Swiss-Prot record:
The lineage of its organism: Eukaryota, Metazoa, Chordata, Craniata, Vertebrata. It is linked to Myopia 23, autosomal recessive: A refractive error of the eye, in which parallel rays from a distant object come to focus in front of the retina, vision being better for near objects than for far. Transmembrane segments: none annotated. The gene is LRPAP1. Molecular chaperone for LDL receptor-related proteins that may regulate their ligand binding activity along the secretory pathway. Belongs to the alpha-2-MRAP family. N-glycosylated. Interacts with the LRP1/alpha-2-macroglobulin receptor heavy and light chains; the interaction is transient and coincides with a reduction of ligand binding by the receptor. Interacts with LRP2/glycoprotein 330. Interacts with LRP1B; binding is followed by internalization and degradation. Interacts with LDLR. Interacts with SORL1. Interacts with LRP1; this interaction is followed by rapid internalization. It is found in: Rough endoplasmic reticulum lumen; Endoplasmic reticulum-Golgi intermediate compartment lumen; Golgi apparatus, cis-Golgi network; Golgi apparatus lumen. This is Alpha-2-macroglobulin receptor-associated protein.
């Protein structure tokens, strides 16, 4: 029953669900996050099969999850302390 199968995705997802975003902002975040899940999951398969040795693909996906967050501003708040 986990929206996805990756901890990073399930973590960001649970995070939004925690901030309780409207069905529109959450439907857009969940949808966009899904596409990111299709590529991300596909990535777990990449390393699993041994296709990305330089995690370069993972870096693009990461930078994407990072962009998606920088887009919804849901990047969080502290977590890193400022």
């Amino acid at each position: 029953g986990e929206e996805f199968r990756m901890e990073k995705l399930n973590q960001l997802w649970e995070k939004a669900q925690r901030l309780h975003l409207p069905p529109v902002r959450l439907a857009e975040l969940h949808a966009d996050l899904k596409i990111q899940e299709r590529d991300e999951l596909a990535w777990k398969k990449l390393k699993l099969d041994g296709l990305d040795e330089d995690g370069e693909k993972e870096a693009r996906l990461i930078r994407n999850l990072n962009v998606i967050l920088a887009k919804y501003g849901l990047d969080g708040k502290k977590d890193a302390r400022q």
